[model samples]
Target: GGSEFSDRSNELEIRGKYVVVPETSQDMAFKCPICKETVTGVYDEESGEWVWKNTIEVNGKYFHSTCYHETSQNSS
Candidate 1:
């Protein structure tokens, strides 16, 4: 799956594709706590699943990198 981020300030627009990991018997996917958009990124080998590292900032708020990880871990 993919998502697009638009910035009109500098006439810059970009789109990125991310691997979507659906909910499994033991794990589940969740949206970003800040943006509320579905988490998108590669899986962390050490963590044993996909995890978000860098936080995407929009407006004046900061999102947590572990937002996806924590949410997924709690989801049944």
Candidate 2:
């Protein structure tokens, strides 16, 4: 038998808002932590995965680049 692989995002991995997470191809939209909107990315169903764009990988989640920029302004 071949080895089994686990492919999933668990709650344990996203316990906090700003935590580093493993990079994996996304199949659907992920909510923006700051904007509270669903960030849509390029989808390639034939390739069996999707990719993100106009998004910045920060902490444990991904956020819209514009949204991220807003956060930066708030901090400054």
Candidate 3:
């Protein structure tokens, strides 16, 4: 059989400083490593641009600001 998916829900501790960026297009969906959630790019009417909602990209990986902050607080 393939590798067991058990313990997949476990969370990891983040270390070091990470510079996060925003997503480009609204069509692409990114999975947040911090919160284990989906980050969808949406149209911001106020800003008149497509932006990832509550999400940030670091080293091409995406994560939620709030969730990332929690981990960074300990490391930074």
Question: TM-scores of all models?
Answer: 0.23, 0.45, 0.52
Q: Which digits, one per residue and each the tens of the lDDT, describe model 2 over residues 1-76?
A: 4256335544333322232222464544578868688755555556655556556675576786656765664534
Candidate ranking (lDDT, best to worst): 3, 2, 1
Candidate 3 residue lDDT tens string, 1-76? 3385544333422322233224544456767765578766556566565665555566766787668766664635
lDDT, model 1, position 52: 38
Rank ordering of all candidates by TM-score, starting from the highest: 3, 2, 1
lDDT of 1 by residue, 1-76 (tens): 2356444432221122233343451243335555566544467566566643344443554344444334434536
Best by TM-score: 3
- Pairwise lDDT winner, candidates 2 and 3: 3
lDDT of 3 at 6: 44
Mark the 10 consecutive residues where model 3 has the least summed lDDT. Answer: 12-21
Off by over 4 Å in 2: 1-26, 43-49, 73-76
Provide the clashing-pair count of each candidate structure: 1, 0, 0
lDDT of 1 at 6: 45
Determine which window of 10 residues in candidate 2 has minimal summed lDDT.
13-22
